Each structure stands twice: as structure tokens, then as C-alpha cells.
């Protein structure tokens, strides 16, 4: 059976596209990309159509992690079709729980991606107002959490 994960933050340009790209690389490298539906989306509509933040794209290039994405907003359907929706911070979590209670079919388990970190950093902080070093931190957290999630889901 295909498994599916949707990575979510506020605008779908900073953290969630990096998590998606990292997770795709992990499954592709283990020959199991065909078995996984992997995507990212926004809680808000501010950035719809936009490519990832240029600084996140630069971070990803340095790491040779493949990233190519068009921002989109989460839809009602996404709660029916995804097995996991993995978000970045408490505001995302609150909004997603709100949206999941306005639909009838919520298959998805909604969790903080950080809840998978062995190094126990629960929040993946918005790097929007930060600098290149903040994007790097985000990348490193995503690697740790995506590995652990792939190994064993809650």
C-alpha cells in the first residue's frame, strides 16, 4: 500500500519545501520513492504559486538535496488522503487542528515534525526573518526528523 506524508508550514516557501525535498531524497535513495506520496503545503494563501525562499533553495543546492516546488495551500481533501501531516510549529499545529475539525473525513495523523527528533528539538522555527545560518539549522532538523519518521511512525 502507498504511504503518504504532507509537510506543512504557514506559507509553503521556507521550512515545508525543505522537509518535503529531504524526505523525498531519503526515500529515493532507499529505492522506495514509488511507494510514497510526498508533498508540502501552506496553512495560509499568501504565497500561492511562489517558488521556495531563495535562501532555502541555496541551502538545498549546497547540500545536493533535490528541490523544485510551487507553493500551494492545504485543502480539505488533504485531510482525507494523507496518512501523516507533519507541521513545523505551534501555530501551524493549532491551525491544522482547526481545519481538521471542519471536515468529515480526517484520515491524517497531525503532528509536529519535531516530535520525531532524537535530539529533542520540538519546534522547527520559522527562518523567514533570520539568515542563512537559520536555514541551515532548519535543514539539519529536517534531516534528523525525516530519518526518524521514515524509520518509525507514531
Curated annotation (Swiss-Prot):
Signal peptide: none annotated. Its main location: cytoplasm. GO terms for molecular function: acid phosphatase activity; non-membrane spanning protein tyrosine phosphatase activity; protein tyrosine phosphatase activity; SH3 domain binding. Keywords: Acetylation, Cytoplasm, Hydrolase, Phosphoprotein, Protein phosphatase. Its EC number is 3.1.3.48, 3.1.3.2. GO terms for cellular component: cytoplasm; cytoplasmic side of plasma membrane; cytosol; extracellular exosome; sarcolemma; synapse. InterPro entries: LMW_PTPase (IPR050438), Ptyr_pPase (IPR023485), Ptyr_pPase_sf (IPR036196), Tyr_Pase_low_mol_wt_mml (IPR002115), Tyr_phospatase_low_mol_wt (IPR017867). The modification Phosphotyrosine is found at residues 128-129. It is an enzyme of class 3 (hydrolase). Disulfide bonds: none annotated. The active site is at residues 9, 15, 126. Inhibited by sulfhydryl reagents. GO terms for biological process: chemical synaptic transmission. It comes from the Eukaryota. It is found in: Cytoplasm. Interacts with EPHA2; dephosphorylates EPHA2. Interacts with EPHB1. Belongs to the low molecular weight phosphotyrosine protein phosphatase family. Acts on tyrosine phosphorylated proteins, low-MW aryl phosphates and natural and synthetic acyl phosphates with differences in substrate specificity between isoform 1 and isoform 2. This is Low molecular weight phosphotyrosine protein phosphatase. It comes from Homo sapiens.
Amino acid at each position: 500500500a502507498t504511504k503518504s506524508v504532507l509537510f506543512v508550514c504557514l506559507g509553503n516557501i521556507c521550512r515545508s519545501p525543505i522537509a518535503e525535498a529531504v524526505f523525498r531524497k531519503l526515500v529515493t535513495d532507499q529505492n522506495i520513492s514509488e511507494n510514497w506520496r510526498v508533498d508540502s503545503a501552506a496553512t495560509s494563501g499568501y504565497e500561492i504559486g511562489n517558488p521556495p525562499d531563495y535562501r532555502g533553495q541555496s541551502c538545498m543546492k549546497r547540500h545536493g538535496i533535490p528541490m523544485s516546488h510551487v507553493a500551494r495551500q492545504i485543502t480539505k481533501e488533504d485531510f482525507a488522503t494523507f496518512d501523516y501531516i507533519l507541521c513545523m510549529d505551534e501555530s501551524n499545529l493549532r491551525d491544522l487542528n482547526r481545519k481538521s475539525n471542519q471536515v468529515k473525513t480526517c484520515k491524517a495523523k497531525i503532528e509536529l515534525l519535531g516530535s520525531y527528533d532524537p535530539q529533542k528539538q520540538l519546534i522547527i522555527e520559522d527562518p523567514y526573518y533570520g539568515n542563512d545560518s537559520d536555514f541551515e539549522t532548519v535543514y539539519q532538523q529536517c534531516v534528523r526528523c525525516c530519518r526518524a519518521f521514515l524509520e518509525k511512525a507514531h
